[PDB]
Every structure is written in C-alpha cells, then in structure tokens.
C-alpha cells in the first residue's frame, strides 16, 4: 500500500499568516491514465469531510483562492496563504492512484490567540438524580486559551480518581476558544457522608489554581 | 443540487453484518464512480472501495473479504454490506464521490455511525443544572445513554451563542455526555431556560426547565 505521510500532525497559526501542510508518499502515484490524484481535504469539528484541492494543484468548486497545492514525485504541499477563522479542523492528503486508496494521518489546524481565562462552574447533584440514587457534580470549565488545563477534585479535601469523567469541546470558531467539562459520579449514599465538594483547575493564565466548590 | 443520502442502523451485533443504503441525487451513476470510506478514532481514515460507473468494483484488501459494493443505476442506489463486524469496525462509514479528474460531483454523505456492540440500547437519564446558593452558566447533564447519538438544543434552538454541549464518554459501559449555555444573569430565572434531548435509538425525547435552587 501507498503510505502517506502527513506533517506536521499539529499546526497552530496566527490569524492571516501562512500554513503550509505536507504529505509524502512512500510511491509515485501517477495512476495508469496519467493523472496524479492526489487530494486534500478539510474536514471541520462535526462535519464530513470537503474536498479543497484535485489532482495535486486544482481548487475545487467554491474553494477560496487563499488554498493552493502543489509538488510531484513523492512530495505534495497544501498552502494556506492567509489563515482564517473558519480553516480551522483536520486537513487530510488522500491518493486514488494506486488501489487501495489511502489517506495521511491528519493534520490539525489550531488558530492561536491571546490566553483567555476559563470562566469555571460548579453544579450540585439535581434534586431528580438525587431522588434515582445517584450523585453527579458537574463543573463546566469554559472559553480558556490554551487548551492544556488540569482539573482536580477534593471531597473533604481527599483526592478523588474514581468517577471523575472529563470531556474537551474542539477549538470554537467564533473566539478560537477550548472549553471542558468534568463530572464527578458519586452514589447519593457517599454523597451524602461529605459536605465539602471542589472543582480546582490549573491553566497557564493562572499560577494559583482556580477553585470552585460549594457545601451540601 | 449534489446530495448522497444514507441509511442504516446504528448498532450492529459482534459477527452481524452491516448494510447501508446511499441514494445519490444531482449526478448520474451510470457516469460516474462511488466510493466508501469510513473514519475511527483507532484507525483514521479508510478507504473502503469503490463502484464504478459500469459496475465493476476495486475493494481494499484488508476488507475484500468480507465487502460488497452494488447498485442500481435507475433507483440511483448503492448498497454498501460489510460481514462478520467486530467492536473495532465501530465508526462513521461515508459514501462519497471522490478523486475526480473532470467533473465537479466531489460530495460526501452525511455518515452512518456505526457501533459494534452486544451492550443494549438505554435511554438517557437527563437532569437539569441550576447553581447553588453578570453572566450566569446552566447546564444539562445527559446520563447513561447508548449507543451514540443524541441532540441536545436549548430553548428549541434560539439559545446559540454561549452553548456548549461536550463530547460523550464512557461511564460503567454507557454515555455521559453535558451542554452548558452561558445567558445574563438578569435574564434567569426572569426568561425561561430549557434544554431539548433526544435519543432517537430509544424513542427519548425531554424537555427539562432549569429552575433555580
Ligand atoms: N484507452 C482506454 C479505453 O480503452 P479501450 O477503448 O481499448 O477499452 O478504456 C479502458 C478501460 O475499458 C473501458 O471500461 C469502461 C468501464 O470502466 C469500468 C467501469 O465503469 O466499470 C471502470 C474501469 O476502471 C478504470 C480503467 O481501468 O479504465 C480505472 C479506475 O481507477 C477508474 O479510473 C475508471 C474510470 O475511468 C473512472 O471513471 C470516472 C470516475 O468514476 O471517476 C468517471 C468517468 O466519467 C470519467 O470522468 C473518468 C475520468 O476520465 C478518469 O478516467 O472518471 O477506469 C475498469 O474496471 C472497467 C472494466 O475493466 C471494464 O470491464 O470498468 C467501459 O465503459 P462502459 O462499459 O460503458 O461502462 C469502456 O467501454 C471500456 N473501453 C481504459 O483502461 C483505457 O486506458
Ligand atoms: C480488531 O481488529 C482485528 C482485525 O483488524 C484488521 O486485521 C488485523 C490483523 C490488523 O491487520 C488490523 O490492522 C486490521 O484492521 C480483529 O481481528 C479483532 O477481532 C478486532 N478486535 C476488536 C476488539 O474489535
Ligand atoms: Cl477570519
């Protein structure tokens, strides 16, 4: 099979400067017709994947014109002349030349911005799951910059592992922002035992950890 | 214009097959070619196979064996059958047209989530976020659902701006999932805030109303 090497596999840029994304083949992928189909896609967080550049160099319909590609041989290059907003997501080289079809790692575009604080919350276990007999404590962690945060949970002051669950949203279009939650899962009984419940996160804008908690 | 319509199931039994349905409208398959192509966190982005415009197929290897691509041309139809599925044949399966040359029919479906699984479908628990005792944060907790997907909205859709509904993880074999919404503070409890789940595997569909304390 035709490898295809794609770096780099993370790229962060500023708004309105250039990218470049690079995809070797292990092959020349010249297929039996003469053409070189070598492609690149944009795929957006939630959507299928869009073709932008065919045959190595050709913009496909409706493709801004800041997308260009190029190269031969075993070396092809996706061109961003000036990054924007909505280019962010996972950008894939593919080749159709040689059966079977292959496509490059990914290469994820990430918008740099200034660092933005996370605006944390903490929520008590509802009245309705408390009634069920379970126990959750949310704490949402939301629009920070950059994406790397640590979050931690004390009960009474013990370190809690056990049913701590974190999830991350993708970069947002709109303020190139991360935003995170993360639930604590307790049986409504342990729940019950302790009082004091704290959601504490660590960020770059921050050298003090950022502590949210409330009493039951 | 160029749509590829999918159906198909959403939960397939370990050694089940799976069947997908594409219904292409805008372009002719007596013309031009149809790919499948399908994406896993496990294993990136697939290559499938291929129908051709007169019929003929190119399978890759590694599925040959257990893949079948046909179609028909006058229904505007392919019929996508992958057998003997295993947990980590879990993952989005497209259709698409792909690696043109002189046209312009460059489309993808929208995908068909796939879960391999022998875990039961159950609906979700969905409970409502208010604070404890400028801007003021509610939420929606999402638990212990399966499979894959639901939709969260909040107010129906007019809450947008400041939503953020996170990505599903696994918790004692089934999802959690939260959304948050971000509204004034001098808006709530004053205007109403509600969030709208639903779980189509499950025939689930709830409206929960934030309400404070
Ligand atoms: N000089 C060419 C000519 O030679 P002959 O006149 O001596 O035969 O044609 C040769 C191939 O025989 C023709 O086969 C077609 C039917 O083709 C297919 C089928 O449709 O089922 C597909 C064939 O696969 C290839 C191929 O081997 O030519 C390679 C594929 O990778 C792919 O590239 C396909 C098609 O060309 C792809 O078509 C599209 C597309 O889907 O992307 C759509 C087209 O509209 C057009 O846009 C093309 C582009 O121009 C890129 O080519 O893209 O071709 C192959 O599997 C054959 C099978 O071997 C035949 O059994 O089936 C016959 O047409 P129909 O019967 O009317 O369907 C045609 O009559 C045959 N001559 C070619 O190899 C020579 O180079
Ligand atoms: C995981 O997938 C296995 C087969 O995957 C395919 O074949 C193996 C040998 C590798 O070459 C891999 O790259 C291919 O995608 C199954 O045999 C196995 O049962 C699967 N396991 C689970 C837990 O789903
Ligand atoms: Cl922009």
């Known amino acids: 099979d035709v490898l295809m090497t794609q770096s780099p596999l993370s790229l962060p840029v500023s708004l309105g400067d250039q990218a470049s994304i690079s995809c070797r083949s292990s092959?020349?992928?010249?297929?039996?017709?003469?053409?070189?189909?070598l492609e690149w896609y944009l795929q957006k967080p939630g959507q299928s994947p869009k073709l932008l550049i065919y045959?190595?160099?050709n913009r496909f319909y409706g493709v801004p014109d800041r997308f260009s590609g190029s190269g031969s041989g075993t070396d092809f290059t996706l061109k961003i002349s000036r990054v924007e907003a909505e280019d962010l997501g996972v950008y894939y080289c593919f080749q159709g030349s040689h059966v079977p079809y292959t496509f490059g790692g990914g290469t994820k575009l990430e918008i740099k911005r200034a660092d933005a604080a996370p605006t944390v919350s903490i929520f008590p276990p509802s009245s309705e799951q408390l009634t069920s007999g379970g126990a959750s404590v949310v704490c949402f962690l939301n629009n920070f910059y950059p994406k790397d945060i640590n979050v931690k949970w004390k009960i009474d002051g013990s370190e809690r592992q056990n049913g701590v669950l974190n999830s991350w949203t993708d970069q947002d279009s709109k303020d190139s922002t991360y935003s995170m939650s993360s639930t604590l899962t307790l049986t409504k009984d342990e729940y019950e035992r302790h009082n004091s419940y704290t959601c504490e996160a660590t960020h770059k804008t921050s050298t003090s950890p950022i502590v949210k908690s409330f009493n039951r | 214009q160029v749509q590829l319509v999918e159906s198909g199931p959403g939960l397939v039994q370990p050694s089940q097959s799976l069947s997908i349905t594409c219904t292409v409208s805008?372009?002719?398959?007596?013309?031009?070619?149809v790919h499948w192509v399908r994406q896993s966190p496990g294993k990136g982005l697939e290559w499938l196979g291929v129908?051709?415009?007169?019929?003929?197929?190119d399978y890759n290897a590694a599925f040959i064996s257990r893949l079948s691509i046909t179609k028909d041309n006058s229904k505007s139809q392919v019929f996508f059958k992958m057998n003997s599925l295993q947990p980590n044949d879990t993952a989005v399966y497209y259709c698409d047209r792909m690696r043109i040359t002189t046209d312009w029919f460059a489309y993808w479906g929208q995908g068909t989530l796939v879960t391999v699984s022998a875990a039961k479908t159950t609906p979700p628990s969905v409970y409502p976020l208010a604070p404890g005792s400028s801007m003021v944060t509610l939420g929606c907790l999402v638990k212990g659902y399966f499979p894959e997907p639901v939709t969260v909205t909040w107010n129906s859709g007019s809450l947008s701006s400041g939503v953020h509904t996170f990505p599903a993880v696994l918790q004692s074999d089934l999802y959690t999932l939260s959304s948050s919404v971000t509204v004034p503070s001098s808006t709530w409890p004053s205007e109403t805030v509600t969030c709208n789940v639903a779980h189509p595997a499950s025939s689930t569909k709830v409206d929960k109303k934030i309400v404070p304390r």
């Open positions: 092959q020349t992928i010249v297929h039996s017709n003469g053409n070189t189909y």
């Open positions: 805008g372009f002719s398959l007596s013309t031009y070619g």
């Open positions: 129908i051709w415009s007169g019929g003929s197929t």
């Open positions: 045959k190595v160099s």
